[PDB]
Amino acid sequence: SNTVMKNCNYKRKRRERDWDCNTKKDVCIPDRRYQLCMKELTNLVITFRKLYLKRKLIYDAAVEGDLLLKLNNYRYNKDFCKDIRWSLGDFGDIIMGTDMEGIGYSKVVENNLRSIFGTDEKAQQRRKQWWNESKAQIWTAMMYSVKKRLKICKLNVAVNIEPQIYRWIREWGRDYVSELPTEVQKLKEKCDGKINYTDKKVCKVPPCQNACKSYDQWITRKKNQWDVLSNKFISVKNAEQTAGIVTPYDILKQELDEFNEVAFENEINKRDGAYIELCVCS
Amino acid sequence: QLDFEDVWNSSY
């Protein structure tokens, strides 16, 4: 993250900024991660250094949680619980030193953590241990505003540890599923049917052609994102066991309600029936 | 705008 204060004061709206696959070539970073509140973790200069870290983390987490609730228009629902889960997870990887963003102020935080837990070859074990001891309280802190200010989120699911790439694929899948129907709706509004007895509208109608171009650009980003994320999953998996999850697709099948692998690959490769009907002249 | 003390004591 290249900012420190602002992202602890407000969040950009959902899918306002798409996943970023260009900053670091072998991963795509979600806007939520870029904006993760880490103000206190950044600006901080033994058993007590750990204690001070705990206080700072508790406070950054409570603010992050509050801002995620606000981002969701104060709705206490699944979208909120998932966001809490994703951000909690990212805090965990930051603490454990296995976060994949590593941009700007995230580097400062990592330096601070190395200053705290040290850098020897058993430091990583200590960081993981400290996280496992603290994670339940960090989750609880993220739920502060919901408890205190607001007028169904499950700890156990939230604090269960899995690699960041797994979690990011879950979050990505849920974004994709939300975006698809919207993008299709925009297409149908302009491209449904024919312009004459024989030719689809996309053959001649500029607004439809523009619409197909916009869809093309969107689906091309989705394809690129799946490509990058799914391959990061494989490389991470090869270099590291999770029961029930063998392929990146298994994550989507388990996270999403109605996933179908063949249909999904059809969609992101522009060979699904609906896209062809609407956007392919012949 | 969150009160640290209240947050700290609420988190346990």
Author numbering:
A (entry chain A): 210 to 254, 265 to 370, 376 to 464, 467 to 508
B (entry chain C): 19 to 30
Quote the paper.
In this structure, two DBP-RIIs (DBP1 and DBP2) bind a single DARC (DARC A) creating the heterotrimer with a total buried surface area of 2241.8 Å2. Additionally, in the heterotrimer, the second DARC binding site is preformed to accept another DARC. In the heterotrimer structure, a new DBP-RII homodimer interface is created by a translation of 7 residues covering 12 Å along helix 4, relative to the unbound structure. The DBP-RII homodimer interface is composed of DBP1 residues I265-R274 and DBP2 residues F261-Y278 in the heterotrimer, and DBP1 residues H262-R274 and DBP2 residues F261-Y278 in the heterotetramer. In the heterotrimer, residues H262-T266 make contacts at the secondary interface. In addition to the dimer interface, each DARC binding site, one in the heterotrimer and two in the heterotetramer, can be broken into two interfaces: a primary DARC binding interface with one DBP-RII monomer, and a secondary DARC binding interface created by the second DBP-RII monomer. The primary DARC binding interface in both structures consists of DBP-RII residues L270-K289 of helix 4 and Q356-K367 of helix 7. DARC is induced to form an amphipathic helix in the crystal structures upon binding and engages a positively charged groove at the DBP-RII dimer interface. The heterotrimer and heterotetramer could represent DBP-RII binding to a DARC heterodimer or homodimer, respectively. Specifically, the two bound forms of DBP-RII observed in the crystal structures suggest that an initial binding event followed by receptor-induced DBP dimerization leads to a DBP∶DARC heterotrimer that subsequently binds to a second DARC monomer to create the final heterotetrameric assembly.
